[PDB]
């Protein structure tokens, strides 16, 4: 049919451009004209064919607007390429902005155009109008409707981020993403936020004549001095691009935190915990106090937010560079420890606990509590230097919590306390051997501070109910606890 | 076979925790309390009762009306009329106080009652503060004050008799004896619960015989 005529024409054009590109410069327009047909099948095939040639023909560099025989041939070829590629991007934008639904006859023109856009993104980012192509991508992933095109664009941008080693593409993409988030007033689906986590940059004797040999030496020293200069310049430019991208990312994160968007806090906190070691020192301290103020505002949903903030602070402090910076940077987690200790009771009484590679953005409040408890009692660093008063107070409070908290979470708490007894032992054996109960005061349950509540002037008497809890799992967990206490 | 039953009962009571459907949860909690009294299986229900309390209906001031108190042995649902009604307020407070009473008298002897009531006591105190900073529901206010007073007294009682109980990890004879020789009217919570049961029964008699006289008069 007319479709067959288009088949032959498109095949001839594509093969001609593959074989001799320079000698045939007008096909780039001829191809736009043959795509101008109103037949949908011909339109789809023209779009995919244009994807294929523009892919193979684009040079490993960008060209300059000339303005103002082989050289003229190249000039003309190059100018036709840019004009045709600009037309291609305009057509892709129009098709993608066009309405998706038609009669069910395979993948629509919108889906095919989106696939083409993803392929161009992943194939030739360096060439011109990367901005327009990424604008198409963002105009798709700014809609809050999960779709196959949505996920496809998502992994396209993800692969671009994880493969960009230069940085300009990353900078343009993050600028577009931040502007989109601000314009949409932070009503996005958190995947565009996880892209920021997915960034990479934030982590035979040939005979030679006498003339040929001297010239070759000349290029040798020229290329040596150029390699040295290029190394230095690339280092400086990579650092500057990192600075710009980090600026944009942290601006987005802090605007989200200030706006208090409930469904993005986990991703924002994950990003902060990931990149605060890449930002300066004074900003690390300021971020700690920002987390403190978030906790205080929640004090004046809320449980999950407080636990997220506590987990982020503790993880940031378990970062290696931050761990060594500790004393010099004056980073004290006493506020977070005290807040967790005081909130344990309300968390125990909260019935919303079990309503639900990653390190922060965890959907379960019980899981967040377990991470906080692991941070406070079983730390990656200085595990055997933890204050015994802190250990004993948290042991008593967690036994009371496990007494008053649902089955599976209680099993988790018993496991954590078993691990604590395994690691420390002799420090906490007095909490169960009543002959070693200190008599230098009385236990204060409803205290205000961990040291204030005398932990060694009391006995863990809860077992007498958690051995008759209804769940065999928690019963056997307590049995294991007593077993290892005995095998101390 | 208790494990699946308590699992499904908790699932049923937490399916859709709404003001319209308090009484289904209430009956399920009564069933679980019967099971707890019979067996020797600990069933956490303080979270459920404290959620019932920390529901939305209890915060806002009630609606002054004149309609019949609910018969919370025949209700699967709450009539649309009873939304903010002070009568619904009073009812739900009455049986919340009840179910709390049976739970805390059920476990009123074990060596850990002190701990077992600490979260409940602090939550109730937070509520007395928050609701005398809420509504004006003084009968429930007073009933909760009496309940928390009794809880604190019983906690102080067990700890007084706890002092000398050697609980070495390889020697639990004394703790396996604690107060084998006491009965659940001697504890302060036991006395309070039996008094409240007597009052509940006399009110039951009053209203039952009453409705009988109205039936006879209508006849």
């Amino acid at each position: 049919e007319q479709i067959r005529q288009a088949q032959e024409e498109l095949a001839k054009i594509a093969t001609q451009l593959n074989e001799n590109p320079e000698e045939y410069p007008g096909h780039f327009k001829a191809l736009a004209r043959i795509g101008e047909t109103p037949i949908l099948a011909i339109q789809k095939l023209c779009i995919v064919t244009q994807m294929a040639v523009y892919k193979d023909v684009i040079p490993g560099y960008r060209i300059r607007p000339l303005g103002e025989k082989e050289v003229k041939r190249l000039r003309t070829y190059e100018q036709a390429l840019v004009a045709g590629y600009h037309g291609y991007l305009k057509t892709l934008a129009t098709y993608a902005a066009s309405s998706i639904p038609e009669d069910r006859k395979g993948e629509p023109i919108s889906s095919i155009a989106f696939t083409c856009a993803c392929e161009l993104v992943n194939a030739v980012p360096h060439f011109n109008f990367r901005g327009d192509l990424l604008r198409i991508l963002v105009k798709k992933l700014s809609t809050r409707k999960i779709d196959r095109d949505f996920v496809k664009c998502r992994e396209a941008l993800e692969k671009l981020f994880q493969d960009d080693e230069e940085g300009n593409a990353s900078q343009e993409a993050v600028s577009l993403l931040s502007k989109m988030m601000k314009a949409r007033e932070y009503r996005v689906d958190e995947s565009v936020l996880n892209l920021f986590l997915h960034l990479r940059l934030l982590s035979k004797w040939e005979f030679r004549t006498k003339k040929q040999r001297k010239l070759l030496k000349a290029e040798k020293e020229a290329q040596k001095v150029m390699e040295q200069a290029d190394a230095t310049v690339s280092h400086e430019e990579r650092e500057r691009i990192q600075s710009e991208i980090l600026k944009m990312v942290f601006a987005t994160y802090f605007r989200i935190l200030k706006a208090r968007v409930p469904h993005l806090m986990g991703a924002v906190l994950e990003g902060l915990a990931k990149y605060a070691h890449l930002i300066n020192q004074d900003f690390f301290g300021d971020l700690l106090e920002a987390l403190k103020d978030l906790i205080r505002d929640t004090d004046r949903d809320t449980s999950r937010e407080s636990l997220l903030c506590t987990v982020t602070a503790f993880a940031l402090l378990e970062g290696q560079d931050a761990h060594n910076a500790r004393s010099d940077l004056h980073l004290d987690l006493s506020f977070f420890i005290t807040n967790l200790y005081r909130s344990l009771l309300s968390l125990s009484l909260n019935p919303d606990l079990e309503l639900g590679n990653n390190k922060i953005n965890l959907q379960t409040t019980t899981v967040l509590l377990l991470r906080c408890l692991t941070s406070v009692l079983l730390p990656p660093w200085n595990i055997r230097s933890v204050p015994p008063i802190r250990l004993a107070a948290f042991c008593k409070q967690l036994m009371t919590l496990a007494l008053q908290v649902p089955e599976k979470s209680s099993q988790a708490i018993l496991g954590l306390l078993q691990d604590v007894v395994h690691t420390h032992g002799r420090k906490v054996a007095a909490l169960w051997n009543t002959e070693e109960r200190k008599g230098d005061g009385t236990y204060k349950p409803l205290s205000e501070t961990v040291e204030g509540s005398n932990p060694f002037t009391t006995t863990i008497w809860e077992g007498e109910l958690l051995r008759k809890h209804y769940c065999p799992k928690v019963r056997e967990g307590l049995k294991a606890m007593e077993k290892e206490l005995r095998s101390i | 076979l208790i494990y699946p039953l308590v699992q499904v009962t908790l699932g049923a009571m937490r399916l859709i925790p709404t003001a319209i459907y308090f009484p289904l949860r209430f009956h399920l909690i009564r069933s679980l309390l019967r099971l707890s009294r019979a067996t020797d299986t600990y069933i956490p229900l303080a979270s459920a009762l404290l959620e019932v309390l920390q529901s939305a209906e209890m915060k806002k001031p009630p609606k002054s009306s004149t309609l019949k108190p609910l018969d919370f042995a025949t209700a699967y649902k709450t009539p649309k009329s009873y939304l903010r009604t002070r009568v619904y307020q009073d009812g739900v407070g009455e049986q919340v106080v009840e179910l709390l009473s049976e739970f805390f008298v059920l476990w009123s002897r074990n060596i850990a009652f002190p701990e077992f009531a600490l979260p409940t006591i602090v939550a109730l105190k937070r509520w007395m503060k928050e609701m005398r900073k809420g509504n004006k529901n003084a009968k429930l206010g007073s009933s909760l004050v009496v309940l928390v007073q009794k809880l604190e007294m019983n906690a102080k009682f067990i700890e007084e008799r706890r002092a000398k109980v050697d609980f070495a990890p390889k020697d639990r004879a004394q703790v396996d004896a604690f107060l084998k020789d006491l009965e659940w009217e001697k504890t302060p919570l036991g006395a309070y619960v039996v008094a409240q049961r007597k009052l509940r029964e006399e009110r039951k008699r009053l209203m039952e015989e009453a409705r009988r006289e109205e039936e006879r008069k209508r006849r």
Partner: peptide
């Protein structure tokens, strides 16, 4: 040990232990 292998999120799915 126990802390990590029960702090994994997938441990709290909520499957009733009668439909094993």
């Amino acid at each position: 040990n126990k802390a990590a292998e029960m702090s994994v999120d997938d441990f709290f799915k909520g499957g009733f232990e009668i439909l094993s």
